Amino acid sequence: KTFIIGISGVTNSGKTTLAKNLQKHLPNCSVISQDDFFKPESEIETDKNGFLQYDVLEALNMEKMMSAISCWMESARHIPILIIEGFLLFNYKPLDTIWNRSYFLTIPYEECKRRRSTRVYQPPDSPGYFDGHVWPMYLKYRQEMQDITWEVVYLDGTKSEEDLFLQVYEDLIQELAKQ
Ligand SMILES: Nc1ncnc2c1ncn2[C@@H]1O[C@H](COP(=O)(O)OP(=O)(O)O)[C@@H](O)[C@H]1O
Numbered sequence: 671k672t673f674i675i676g677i678s679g680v681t682n683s684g685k686t687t688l689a690k691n692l693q694k695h696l697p698n699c700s701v702i703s704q705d706d707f708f709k710p711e712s713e714i715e716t717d718k719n720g721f722l723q724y725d726v727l728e729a730l731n732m733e734k735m736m737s738a739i740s741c742w743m744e745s746a747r748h749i750p751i752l753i754i755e756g757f758l759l760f761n762y763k764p765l766d767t768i769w770n771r772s773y774f775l776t777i778p779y780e781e782c783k784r785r786r787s788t789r790v791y792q793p794p795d796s797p798g799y800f801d802g803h804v805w806p807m808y809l810k811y812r813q814e815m816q817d818i819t820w821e822v823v824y825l826d827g828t829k830s831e832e833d834l835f836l837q838v839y840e841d842l843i844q845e846l847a848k849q
């Protein structure tokens with residue numbers, strides 16, 4: 671009765687952008703962004719080397735988010751589409767049995783690091799934060815995904831913004847078609 675779509679991938683791979691596009695052209699379509707569930711700065715930890723721990727599941731209120739998803743799901747039974755976009759989704763076990771479609775955006779190390787630097791975060795990226803925490807954590811996430819039993823459709827984040835949208839858009843109808 672409801673279609674749940676997952677969109678993950680490394681930071682700045684283009685998740686927000688894909689989510690918004692599908693959102694505009696998809697009927698009865700909602701969006702939940704994993705980033706709205708970050709714990710307050712006062713709750714974040716810094717490792718030995720003085721790096722704030724943001725790229726780990728512990729830096730996000732995931733029980734808050736699952737509750738937000740349950741709300742949507744149950745109020746939906748009253749075809750509803752939910753796009754859940756986030757940089758750390760396919761390694762959070764409670765979601766595995768909820769996905770109807772999973773997409774993973776990939777972007778090279780150089781492009782990613784570049785895009786990242788055009789964005790001022792809060793707290794701002796400390797010196798060598800990207801190499802010292804962001805990249806290492808993504809790689810650690812990519813590895814925690816070697817265990818995935820279901821099917822994740824990999825996307826090329828270097829591709830056109832509309833080419834990615836269209837690739838996903840077609841498929842989503844060739845998936846709703848069997849509905
Ligand atoms: N396909 C694309 N090609 C080039 N730049 C892109 C593309 N998609 C997004 N961007 C840019 O990359 C940066 C971050 O994109 P964003 O959608 O926020 O990705 P994410 O949600 O994974 O961090 C922004 O400058 C965005 O405009």
Ligand SMILES: NC(=O)c1csc([C@@H]2O[C@H](CO)[C@@H](O)[C@H]2O)n1
Pocket residue numbers: 681705708724725757791792793804
């Ligand atoms: N305040 C925040 O929410 C925050 C500070 S840095 C940050 C970044 O969010 C990215 C995932 O989208 C992750 O790489 C964090 O470094 N978030």
